[PDB]
Amino acid sequence: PQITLWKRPLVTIKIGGQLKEALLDTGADDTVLEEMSLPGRWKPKMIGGIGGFIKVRQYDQILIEICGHKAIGTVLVGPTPVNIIGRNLLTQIGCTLNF
Amino acid sequence: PQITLWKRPLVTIKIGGQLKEALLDTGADDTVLEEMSLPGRWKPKMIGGIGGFIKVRQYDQILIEICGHKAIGTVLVGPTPVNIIGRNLLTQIGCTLNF
């Protein structure tokens, strides 16, 4: 749908069979989730943010359902203080910015 | 207008008489800009991000022009690696998310 920004754009996601909440984050190239139980293999990774860097695990071709819209793509897992849906998956769901 | 997210949503801003580029960042409550020459008074501040915290200066009722739309509101200044337009100003310009 349409979503205004007077509040945090928080949505429900399903990933790895689990239900979580996450932020629609146009300022994120990438999707980064708190430590979770994800099946499979993964390669080590570093990502930058305000405040410095975190080390994360990069899983590829992960299926994730975002507010009812499915996507498959990279999901990084690690010590992020907030679940973040980044542009790699926002594009897949047809999400746009309008003003 | 409308803006898709296949690339970073970077826009031109004018603030303090200067021209800069910034990210339309739905994942930011607040607007945070690199160190700049802003007129006036300001109170000390801390803000959190991925990676940890940064100390910033909080200027209030700052006028800023964002891609042609004017807003007045809080602008935090500090060691952010990227100029960030947050929800406090995105709401003022009628920016929404759509999918």
Ligand SMILES: COc1ccc(S(=O)(=O)N(CC(C)C)C[C@@H](O)[C@H](Cc2ccccc2)n2cc(CNC(=O)c3ccc(CNC(=O)OC(C)(C)C)cc3)nn2)cc1
């Ligand atoms: C390669 O791929 C990527 C690389 C980098 C990223 S990123 O680091 O997450 N990122 C870009 C970054 C360089 C600015 C996307 C951005 O949107 C994150 C989002 C973010 C927000 C919070 C924490 C980590 C990251 N973000 C927002 C802010 C500004 N501060 C707050 O909004 C802000 C808002 C709230 C608070 C605290 N308020 C509160 O009461 O509770 C919370 C902690 C839940 C916010 C503090 C700062 N600082 N970081 C993403 C992907």
